Amino acid sequence: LVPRGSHMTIDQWLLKNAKEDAIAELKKAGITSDFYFNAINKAKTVEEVNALKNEILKAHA
């Protein structure tokens, strides 16, 4: 888990953890694109992170 700073709501913390987990999954699949990682980092909901991640994996499969 990304640990949670005092600066950070639970909601923000869960979103940051989803982003990190998605990027880790992309890396496991051989994606090395910062452009794609940045898109995940700009996402505003966990579902957007999931959808970005899933589409990249599908495109790369």
mmJSON file of the N, C-alpha and C atoms, coordinates in Angstrom:
{"data_MODEL":{"atom_site":{
"group_PDB":["ATOM","ATOM","ATOM","ATOM","ATOM","ATOM","ATOM","ATOM","ATOM","ATOM","ATOM","ATOM","ATOM","ATOM","ATOM","ATOM","ATOM","ATOM","ATOM","ATOM","ATOM","ATOM","ATOM","ATOM","ATOM","ATOM","ATOM","ATOM","ATOM","ATOM","ATOM","ATOM","ATOM","ATOM","ATOM","ATOM","ATOM","ATOM","ATOM","ATOM","ATOM","ATOM","ATOM","ATOM","ATOM","ATOM","ATOM","ATOM","ATOM","ATOM","ATOM","ATOM","ATOM","ATOM","ATOM","ATOM","ATOM","ATOM","ATOM","ATOM","ATOM","ATOM","ATOM","ATOM","ATOM","ATOM","ATOM","ATOM","ATOM","ATOM","ATOM","ATOM","ATOM","ATOM","ATOM","ATOM","ATOM","ATOM","ATOM","ATOM","ATOM","ATOM","ATOM","ATOM","ATOM","ATOM","ATOM","ATOM","ATOM","ATOM","ATOM","ATOM","ATOM","ATOM","ATOM","ATOM","ATOM","ATOM","ATOM","ATOM","ATOM","ATOM","ATOM","ATOM","ATOM","ATOM","ATOM","ATOM","ATOM","ATOM","ATOM","ATOM","ATOM","ATOM","ATOM","ATOM","ATOM","ATOM","ATOM","ATOM","ATOM","ATOM","ATOM","ATOM","ATOM","ATOM","ATOM","ATOM","ATOM","ATOM","ATOM","ATOM","ATOM","ATOM","ATOM","ATOM","ATOM","ATOM","ATOM","ATOM","ATOM","ATOM","ATOM","ATOM","ATOM","ATOM","ATOM","ATOM","ATOM","ATOM","ATOM","ATOM","ATOM","ATOM","ATOM","ATOM","ATOM","ATOM","ATOM","ATOM","ATOM","ATOM","ATOM","ATOM","ATOM","ATOM","ATOM","ATOM","ATOM","ATOM","ATOM","ATOM","ATOM","ATOM","ATOM","ATOM","ATOM","ATOM","ATOM","ATOM","ATOM","ATOM","ATOM"],
"id":[1,2,3,4,5,6,7,8,9,10,11,12,13,14,15,16,17,18,19,20,21,22,23,24,25,26,27,28,29,30,31,32,33,34,35,36,37,38,39,40,41,42,43,44,45,46,47,48,49,50,51,52,53,54,55,56,57,58,59,60,61,62,63,64,65,66,67,68,69,70,71,72,73,74,75,76,77,78,79,80,81,82,83,84,85,86,87,88,89,90,91,92,93,94,95,96,97,98,99,100,101,102,103,104,105,106,107,108,109,110,111,112,113,114,115,116,117,118,119,120,121,122,123,124,125,126,127,128,129,130,131,132,133,134,135,136,137,138,139,140,141,142,143,144,145,146,147,148,149,150,151,152,153,154,155,156,157,158,159,160,161,162,163,164,165,166,167,168,169,170,171,172,173,174,175,176,177,178,179,180,181,182,183],
"type_symbol":["N","C","C","N","C","C","N","C","C","N","C","C","N","C","C","N","C","C","N","C","C","N","C","C","N","C","C","N","C","C","N","C","C","N","C","C","N","C","C","N","C","C","N","C","C","N","C","C","N","C","C","N","C","C","N","C","C","N","C","C","N","C","C","N","C","C","N","C","C","N","C","C","N","C","C","N","C","C","N","C","C","N","C","C","N","C","C","N","C","C","N","C","C","N","C","C","N","C","C","N","C","C","N","C","C","N","C","C","N","C","C","N","C","C","N","C","C","N","C","C","N","C","C","N","C","C","N","C","C","N","C","C","N","C","C","N","C","C","N","C","C","N","C","C","N","C","C","N","C","C","N","C","C","N","C","C","N","C","C","N","C","C","N","C","C","N","C","C","N","C","C","N","C","C","N","C","C","N","C","C","N","C","C"],
"label_atom_id":["N","CA","C","N","CA","C","N","CA","C","N","CA","C","N","CA","C","N","CA","C","N","CA","C","N","CA","C","N","CA","C","N","CA","C","N","CA","C","N","CA","C","N","CA","C","N","CA","C","N","CA","C","N","CA","C","N","CA","C","N","CA","C","N","CA","C","N","CA","C","N","CA","C","N","CA","C","N","CA","C","N","CA","C","N","CA","C","N","CA","C","N","CA","C","N","CA","C","N","CA","C","N","CA","C","N","CA","C","N","CA","C","N","CA","C","N","CA","C","N","CA","C","N","CA","C","N","CA","C","N","CA","C","N","CA","C","N","CA","C","N","CA","C","N","CA","C","N","CA","C","N","CA","C","N","CA","C","N","CA","C","N","CA","C","N","CA","C","N","CA","C","N","CA","C","N","CA","C","N","CA","C","N","CA","C","N","CA","C","N","CA","C","N","CA","C","N","CA","C","N","CA","C","N","CA","C","N","CA","C","N","CA","C"],
"label_alt_id":[null,null,null,null,null,null,null,null,null,null,null,null,null,null,null,null,null,null,null,null,null,null,null,null,null,null,null,null,null,null,null,null,null,null,null,null,null,null,null,null,null,null,null,null,null,null,null,null,null,null,null,null,null,null,null,null,null,null,null,null,null,null,null,null,null,null,null,null,null,null,null,null,null,null,null,null,null,null,null,null,null,null,null,null,null,null,null,null,null,null,null,null,null,null,null,null,null,null,null,null,null,null,null,null,null,null,null,null,null,null,null,null,null,null,null,null,null,null,null,null,null,null,null,null,null,null,null,null,null,null,null,null,null,null,null,null,null,null,null,null,null,null,null,null,null,null,null,null,null,null,null,null,null,null,null,null,null,null,null,null,null,null,null,null,null,null,null,null,null,null,null,null,null,null,null,null,null,null,null,null,null,null,null],
"label_comp_id":["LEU","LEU","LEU","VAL","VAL","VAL","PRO","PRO","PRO","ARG","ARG","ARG","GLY","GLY","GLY","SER","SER","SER","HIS","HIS","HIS","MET","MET","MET","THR","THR","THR","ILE","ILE","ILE","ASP","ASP","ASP","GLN","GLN","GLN","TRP","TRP","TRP","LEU","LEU","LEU","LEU","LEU","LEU","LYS","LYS","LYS","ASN","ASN","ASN","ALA","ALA","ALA","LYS","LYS","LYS","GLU","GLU","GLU","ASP","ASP","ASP","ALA","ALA","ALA","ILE","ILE","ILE","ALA","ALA","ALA","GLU","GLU","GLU","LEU","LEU","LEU","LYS","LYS","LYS","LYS","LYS","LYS","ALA","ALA","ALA","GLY","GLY","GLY","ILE","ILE","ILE","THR","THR","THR","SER","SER","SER","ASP","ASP","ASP","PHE","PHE","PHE","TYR","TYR","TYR","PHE","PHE","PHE","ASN","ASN","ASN","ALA","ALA","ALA","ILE","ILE","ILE","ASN","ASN","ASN","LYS","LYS","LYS","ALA","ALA","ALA","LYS","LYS","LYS","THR","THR","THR","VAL","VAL","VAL","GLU","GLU","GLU","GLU","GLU","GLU","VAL","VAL","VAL","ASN","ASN","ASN","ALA","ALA","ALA","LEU","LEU","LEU","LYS","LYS","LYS","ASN","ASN","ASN","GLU","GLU","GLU","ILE","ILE","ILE","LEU","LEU","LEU","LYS","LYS","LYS","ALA","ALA","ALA","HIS","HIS","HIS","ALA","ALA","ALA"],
"label_asym_id":["A","A","A","A","A","A","A","A","A","A","A","A","A","A","A","A","A","A","A","A","A","A","A","A","A","A","A","A","A","A","A","A","A","A","A","A","A","A","A","A","A","A","A","A","A","A","A","A","A","A","A","A","A","A","A","A","A","A","A","A","A","A","A","A","A","A","A","A","A","A","A","A","A","A","A","A","A","A","A","A","A","A","A","A","A","A","A","A","A","A","A","A","A","A","A","A","A","A","A","A","A","A","A","A","A","A","A","A","A","A","A","A","A","A","A","A","A","A","A","A","A","A","A","A","A","A","A","A","A","A","A","A","A","A","A","A","A","A","A","A","A","A","A","A","A","A","A","A","A","A","A","A","A","A","A","A","A","A","A","A","A","A","A","A","A","A","A","A","A","A","A","A","A","A","A","A","A","A","A","A","A","A","A"],
"label_entity_id":["1","1","1","1","1","1","1","1","1","1","1","1","1","1","1","1","1","1","1","1","1","1","1","1","1","1","1","1","1","1","1","1","1","1","1","1","1","1","1","1","1","1","1","1","1","1","1","1","1","1","1","1","1","1","1","1","1","1","1","1","1","1","1","1","1","1","1","1","1","1","1","1","1","1","1","1","1","1","1","1","1","1","1","1","1","1","1","1","1","1","1","1","1","1","1","1","1","1","1","1","1","1","1","1","1","1","1","1","1","1","1","1","1","1","1","1","1","1","1","1","1","1","1","1","1","1","1","1","1","1","1","1","1","1","1","1","1","1","1","1","1","1","1","1","1","1","1","1","1","1","1","1","1","1","1","1","1","1","1","1","1","1","1","1","1","1","1","1","1","1","1","1","1","1","1","1","1","1","1","1","1","1","1"],
"label_seq_id":[1,1,1,2,2,2,3,3,3,4,4,4,5,5,5,6,6,6,7,7,7,8,8,8,9,9,9,10,10,10,11,11,11,12,12,12,13,13,13,14,14,14,15,15,15,16,16,16,17,17,17,18,18,18,19,19,19,20,20,20,21,21,21,22,22,22,23,23,23,24,24,24,25,25,25,26,26,26,27,27,27,28,28,28,29,29,29,30,30,30,31,31,31,32,32,32,33,33,33,34,34,34,35,35,35,36,36,36,37,37,37,38,38,38,39,39,39,40,40,40,41,41,41,42,42,42,43,43,43,44,44,44,45,45,45,46,46,46,47,47,47,48,48,48,49,49,49,50,50,50,51,51,51,52,52,52,53,53,53,54,54,54,55,55,55,56,56,56,57,57,57,58,58,58,59,59,59,60,60,60,61,61,61],
"pdbx_PDB_ins_code":[null,null,null,null,null,null,null,null,null,null,null,null,null,null,null,null,null,null,null,null,null,null,null,null,null,null,null,null,null,null,null,null,null,null,null,null,null,null,null,null,null,null,null,null,null,null,null,null,null,null,null,null,null,null,null,null,null,null,null,null,null,null,null,null,null,null,null,null,null,null,null,null,null,null,null,null,null,null,null,null,null,null,null,null,null,null,null,null,null,null,null,null,null,null,null,null,null,null,null,null,null,null,null,null,null,null,null,null,null,null,null,null,null,null,null,null,null,null,null,null,null,null,null,null,null,null,null,null,null,null,null,null,null,null,null,null,null,null,null,null,null,null,null,null,null,null,null,null,null,null,null,null,null,null,null,null,null,null,null,null,null,null,null,null,null,null,null,null,null,null,null,null,null,null,null,null,null,null,null,null,null,null,null],
"Cartn_x":[0.849,0.0,0.864,0.384,1.054,0.709,1.67,1.034,0.329,-0.466,-1.382,-0.815,-0.492,0.036,-1.118,-0.804,-1.873,-2.636,-2.1,-2.587,-3.705,-4.17,-4.818,-6.07,-7.188,-8.433,-8.345,-9.216,-9.284,-9.562,-10.471,-10.839,-9.643,-8.887,-7.694,-6.692,-6.533,-5.569,-5.956,-7.243,-7.673,-7.452,-7.698,-7.461,-5.95,-5.09,-3.627,-3.169,-3.692,-3.357,-3.855,-5.061,-5.524,-4.591,-4.14,-3.254,-1.959,-1.357,-0.128,-0.29,-1.384,-1.635,-1.861,-2.578,-2.786,-1.458,-0.646,0.665,1.501,1.459,2.212,1.715,0.404,-0.146,0.3,0.298,0.774,2.243,3.059,4.496,4.683,3.872,3.96,3.67,2.791,2.42,3.404,4.456,5.47,5.273,4.304,4.117,5.101,5.781,6.815,6.549,5.346,5.043,4.692,5.532,5.174,3.919,3.667,2.468,1.251,1.257,0.122,0.058,1.197,1.196,0.661,1.011,0.549,-0.971,-1.547,-3.009,-3.631,-3.089,-3.618,-3.465,-2.314,-2.096,-3.002,-3.59,-4.492,-5.945,-6.218,-7.6,-8.182,-9.512,-10.122,-10.975,-11.221,-11.958,-11.262,-11.496,-10.974,-11.514,-12.792,-13.32,-12.629,-12.276,-11.506,-10.143,-9.481,-8.196,-8.387,-9.44,-9.656,-9.851,-10.646,-10.981,-9.734,-8.943,-7.697,-6.812,-6.599,-5.76,-6.271,-7.574,-8.124,-7.992,-8.231,-8.117,-6.674,-5.711,-4.304,-3.924,-4.345,-4.035,-4.651,-5.905,-6.589,-5.875,-5.446,-4.822,-3.493,-2.817,-1.446,-1.416,-2.586,-2.67,-2.41],
"Cartn_y":[-1.23,0.0,1.253,2.327,3.646,4.034,4.416,4.744,6.115,6.375,7.564,8.691,9.802,10.955,11.646,12.517,13.229,14.147,14.408,15.322,14.727,13.55,12.753,12.029,12.347,11.675,10.199,9.395,7.99,7.901,8.73,8.627,8.899,9.953,10.271,9.133,8.594,7.503,6.25,5.891,4.725,4.992,6.226,6.543,6.397,6.922,6.873,5.414,4.603,3.171,2.465,2.793,2.216,2.58,3.835,4.269,3.45,3.345,2.581,1.11,0.499,-0.89,-1.085,-0.145,-0.244,-0.139,0.851,1.011,-0.255,-0.834,-2.108,-3.245,-3.313,-4.318,-4.107,-2.842,-2.517,-2.903,-2.601,-2.954,-4.477,-5.227,-6.701,-7.219,-6.516,-6.889,-6.372,-5.678,-5.18,-3.78,-3.019,-1.643,-0.759,0.109,0.96,2.426,2.728,4.055,5.068,6.077,7.142,7.911,8.033,8.712,7.973,6.639,5.862,5.936,5.797,5.934,7.31,8.356,9.701,9.801,9.117,9.148,8.539,7.418,6.82,7.78,8.439,9.355,10.589,10.92,12.069,11.672,10.37,9.907,10.402,10.618,11.194,10.215,9.018,7.992,6.646,5.742,4.384,3.691,3.926,3.31,3.828,5.121,5.611,4.928,4.781,4.05,2.634,1.94,0.564,0.522,1.47,1.463,1.778,2.779,3.074,1.827,1.249,0.051,-1.083,-1.368,-2.48,-2.283,-1.055,-0.801,-0.95,-0.462,-0.605,-2.077,-2.854,-4.29,-4.995,-4.659,-5.247,-4.885,-3.636,-3.17,-3.882,-4.248,-4.783,-6.306,-6.923,-8.374,-9.052],
"Cartn_z":[0.0,0.0,0.0,-0.621,-0.454,1.013,1.872,3.178,3.166,4.19,4.18,5.045,4.401,5.129,5.84,6.802,7.515,6.58,5.384,4.326,3.518,3.89,2.883,3.352,2.719,3.134,2.83,3.447,3.036,1.547,1.05,-0.338,-1.241,-0.926,-1.731,-1.652,-0.449,-0.232,-1.062,-1.065,-1.872,-3.357,-3.812,-5.221,-5.529,-4.646,-4.908,-4.957,-4.05,-4.057,-5.323,-5.799,-7.048,-8.211,-8.234,-9.32,-9.29,-8.117,-7.995,-8.368,-7.934,-8.25,-9.754,-10.383,-11.816,-12.571,-12.212,-12.878,-12.691,-11.483,-11.229,-12.145,-12.352,-13.238,-14.673,-15.131,-16.48,-16.645,-15.635,-15.662,-15.745,-14.998,-15.034,-16.454,-17.168,-18.54,-19.601,-19.184,-20.108,-20.668,-20.139,-20.542,-19.811,-20.556,-20.008,-20.37,-20.874,-21.358,-20.249,-20.018,-19.093,-19.452,-20.748,-21.231,-20.679,-20.776,-20.281,-18.756,-18.076,-16.592,-16.137,-16.872,-16.528,-16.616,-17.608,-17.792,-16.54,-16.074,-14.867,-13.684,-13.589,-12.484,-12.484,-13.636,-13.752,-13.48,-13.378,-13.204,-11.889,-11.844,-10.639,-9.83,-10.361,-9.634,-9.817,-8.888,-9.006,-10.267,-10.609,-11.797,-13.07,-13.132,-14.268,-14.331,-13.185,-13.153,-13.719,-13.271,-13.711,-15.218,-15.728,-17.152,-17.989,-17.577,-18.274,-18.302,-17.125,-17.015,-17.909,-17.811,-18.59,-20.095,-20.576,-22.019,-22.492,-21.701,-22.093,-22.147,-21.148,-21.16,-22.373,-22.695,-23.849,-25.152,-25.267,-26.494,-26.718,-25.628,-25.602,-25.635,-25.441,-25.301,-26.634],
"occupancy":[1.0,1.0,1.0,1.0,1.0,1.0,1.0,1.0,1.0,1.0,1.0,1.0,1.0,1.0,1.0,1.0,1.0,1.0,1.0,1.0,1.0,1.0,1.0,1.0,1.0,1.0,1.0,1.0,1.0,1.0,1.0,1.0,1.0,1.0,1.0,1.0,1.0,1.0,1.0,1.0,1.0,1.0,1.0,1.0,1.0,1.0,1.0,1.0,1.0,1.0,1.0,1.0,1.0,1.0,1.0,1.0,1.0,1.0,1.0,1.0,1.0,1.0,1.0,1.0,1.0,1.0,1.0,1.0,1.0,1.0,1.0,1.0,1.0,1.0,1.0,1.0,1.0,1.0,1.0,1.0,1.0,1.0,1.0,1.0,1.0,1.0,1.0,1.0,1.0,1.0,1.0,1.0,1.0,1.0,1.0,1.0,1.0,1.0,1.0,1.0,1.0,1.0,1.0,1.0,1.0,1.0,1.0,1.0,1.0,1.0,1.0,1.0,1.0,1.0,1.0,1.0,1.0,1.0,1.0,1.0,1.0,1.0,1.0,1.0,1.0,1.0,1.0,1.0,1.0,1.0,1.0,1.0,1.0,1.0,1.0,1.0,1.0,1.0,1.0,1.0,1.0,1.0,1.0,1.0,1.0,1.0,1.0,1.0,1.0,1.0,1.0,1.0,1.0,1.0,1.0,1.0,1.0,1.0,1.0,1.0,1.0,1.0,1.0,1.0,1.0,1.0,1.0,1.0,1.0,1.0,1.0,1.0,1.0,1.0,1.0,1.0,1.0,1.0,1.0,1.0,1.0,1.0,1.0],
"B_iso_or_equiv":[0.0,0.0,0.0,0.0,0.0,0.0,0.0,0.0,0.0,0.0,0.0,0.0,0.0,0.0,0.0,0.0,0.0,0.0,0.0,0.0,0.0,0.0,0.0,0.0,0.0,0.0,0.0,0.0,0.0,0.0,0.0,0.0,0.0,0.0,0.0,0.0,0.0,0.0,0.0,0.0,0.0,0.0,0.0,0.0,0.0,0.0,0.0,0.0,0.0,0.0,0.0,0.0,0.0,0.0,0.0,0.0,0.0,0.0,0.0,0.0,0.0,0.0,0.0,0.0,0.0,0.0,0.0,0.0,0.0,0.0,0.0,0.0,0.0,0.0,0.0,0.0,0.0,0.0,0.0,0.0,0.0,0.0,0.0,0.0,0.0,0.0,0.0,0.0,0.0,0.0,0.0,0.0,0.0,0.0,0.0,0.0,0.0,0.0,0.0,0.0,0.0,0.0,0.0,0.0,0.0,0.0,0.0,0.0,0.0,0.0,0.0,0.0,0.0,0.0,0.0,0.0,0.0,0.0,0.0,0.0,0.0,0.0,0.0,0.0,0.0,0.0,0.0,0.0,0.0,0.0,0.0,0.0,0.0,0.0,0.0,0.0,0.0,0.0,0.0,0.0,0.0,0.0,0.0,0.0,0.0,0.0,0.0,0.0,0.0,0.0,0.0,0.0,0.0,0.0,0.0,0.0,0.0,0.0,0.0,0.0,0.0,0.0,0.0,0.0,0.0,0.0,0.0,0.0,0.0,0.0,0.0,0.0,0.0,0.0,0.0,0.0,0.0,0.0,0.0,0.0,0.0,0.0,0.0],
"pdbx_formal_charge":[null,null,null,null,null,null,null,null,null,null,null,null,null,null,null,null,null,null,null,null,null,null,null,null,null,null,null,null,null,null,null,null,null,null,null,null,null,null,null,null,null,null,null,null,null,null,null,null,null,null,null,null,null,null,null,null,null,null,null,null,null,null,null,null,null,null,null,null,null,null,null,null,null,null,null,null,null,null,null,null,null,null,null,null,null,null,null,null,null,null,null,null,null,null,null,null,null,null,null,null,null,null,null,null,null,null,null,null,null,null,null,null,null,null,null,null,null,null,null,null,null,null,null,null,null,null,null,null,null,null,null,null,null,null,null,null,null,null,null,null,null,null,null,null,null,null,null,null,null,null,null,null,null,null,null,null,null,null,null,null,null,null,null,null,null,null,null,null,null,null,null,null,null,null,null,null,null,null,null,null,null,null,null],
"auth_seq_id":[1,1,1,2,2,2,3,3,3,4,4,4,5,5,5,6,6,6,7,7,7,8,8,8,9,9,9,10,10,10,11,11,11,12,12,12,13,13,13,14,14,14,15,15,15,16,16,16,17,17,17,18,18,18,19,19,19,20,20,20,21,21,21,22,22,22,23,23,23,24,24,24,25,25,25,26,26,26,27,27,27,28,28,28,29,29,29,30,30,30,31,31,31,32,32,32,33,33,33,34,34,34,35,35,35,36,36,36,37,37,37,38,38,38,39,39,39,40,40,40,41,41,41,42,42,42,43,43,43,44,44,44,45,45,45,46,46,46,47,47,47,48,48,48,49,49,49,50,50,50,51,51,51,52,52,52,53,53,53,54,54,54,55,55,55,56,56,56,57,57,57,58,58,58,59,59,59,60,60,60,61,61,61],
"auth_comp_id":["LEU","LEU","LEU","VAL","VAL","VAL","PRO","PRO","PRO","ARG","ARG","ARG","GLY","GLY","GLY","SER","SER","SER","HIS","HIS","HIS","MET","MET","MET","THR","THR","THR","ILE","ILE","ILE","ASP","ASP","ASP","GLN","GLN","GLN","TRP","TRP","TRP","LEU","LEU","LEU","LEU","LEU","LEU","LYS","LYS","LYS","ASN","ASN","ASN","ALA","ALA","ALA","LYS","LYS","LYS","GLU","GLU","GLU","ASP","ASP","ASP","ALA","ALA","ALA","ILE","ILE","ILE","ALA","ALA","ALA","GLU","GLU","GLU","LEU","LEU","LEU","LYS","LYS","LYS","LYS","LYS","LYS","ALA","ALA","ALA","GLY","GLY","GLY","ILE","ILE","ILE","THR","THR","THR","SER","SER","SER","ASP","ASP","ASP","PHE","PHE","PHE","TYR","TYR","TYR","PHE","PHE","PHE","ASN","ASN","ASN","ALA","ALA","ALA","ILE","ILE","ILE","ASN","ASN","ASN","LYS","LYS","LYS","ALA","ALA","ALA","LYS","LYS","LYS","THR","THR","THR","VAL","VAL","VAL","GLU","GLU","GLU","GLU","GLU","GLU","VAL","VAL","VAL","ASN","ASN","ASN","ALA","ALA","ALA","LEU","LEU","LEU","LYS","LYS","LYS","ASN","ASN","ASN","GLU","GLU","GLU","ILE","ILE","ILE","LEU","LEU","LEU","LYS","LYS","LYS","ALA","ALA","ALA","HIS","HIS","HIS","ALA","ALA","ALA"],
"auth_asym_id":["A","A","A","A","A","A","A","A","A","A","A","A","A","A","A","A","A","A","A","A","A","A","A","A","A","A","A","A","A","A","A","A","A","A","A","A","A","A","A","A","A","A","A","A","A","A","A","A","A","A","A","A","A","A","A","A","A","A","A","A","A","A","A","A","A","A","A","A","A","A","A","A","A","A","A","A","A","A","A","A","A","A","A","A","A","A","A","A","A","A","A","A","A","A","A","A","A","A","A","A","A","A","A","A","A","A","A","A","A","A","A","A","A","A","A","A","A","A","A","A","A","A","A","A","A","A","A","A","A","A","A","A","A","A","A","A","A","A","A","A","A","A","A","A","A","A","A","A","A","A","A","A","A","A","A","A","A","A","A","A","A","A","A","A","A","A","A","A","A","A","A","A","A","A","A","A","A","A","A","A","A","A","A"],
"auth_atom_id":["N","CA","C","N","CA","C","N","CA","C","N","CA","C","N","CA","C","N","CA","C","N","CA","C","N","CA","C","N","CA","C","N","CA","C","N","CA","C","N","CA","C","N","CA","C","N","CA","C","N","CA","C","N","CA","C","N","CA","C","N","CA","C","N","CA","C","N","CA","C","N","CA","C","N","CA","C","N","CA","C","N","CA","C","N","CA","C","N","CA","C","N","CA","C","N","CA","C","N","CA","C","N","CA","C","N","CA","C","N","CA","C","N","CA","C","N","CA","C","N","CA","C","N","CA","C","N","CA","C","N","CA","C","N","CA","C","N","CA","C","N","CA","C","N","CA","C","N","CA","C","N","CA","C","N","CA","C","N","CA","C","N","CA","C","N","CA","C","N","CA","C","N","CA","C","N","CA","C","N","CA","C","N","CA","C","N","CA","C","N","CA","C","N","CA","C","N","CA","C","N","CA","C","N","CA","C","N","CA","C","N","CA","C"],
"pdbx_PDB_model_num":[1,1,1,1,1,1,1,1,1,1,1,1,1,1,1,1,1,1,1,1,1,1,1,1,1,1,1,1,1,1,1,1,1,1,1,1,1,1,1,1,1,1,1,1,1,1,1,1,1,1,1,1,1,1,1,1,1,1,1,1,1,1,1,1,1,1,1,1,1,1,1,1,1,1,1,1,1,1,1,1,1,1,1,1,1,1,1,1,1,1,1,1,1,1,1,1,1,1,1,1,1,1,1,1,1,1,1,1,1,1,1,1,1,1,1,1,1,1,1,1,1,1,1,1,1,1,1,1,1,1,1,1,1,1,1,1,1,1,1,1,1,1,1,1,1,1,1,1,1,1,1,1,1,1,1,1,1,1,1,1,1,1,1,1,1,1,1,1,1,1,1,1,1,1,1,1,1,1,1,1,1,1,1]
}}}
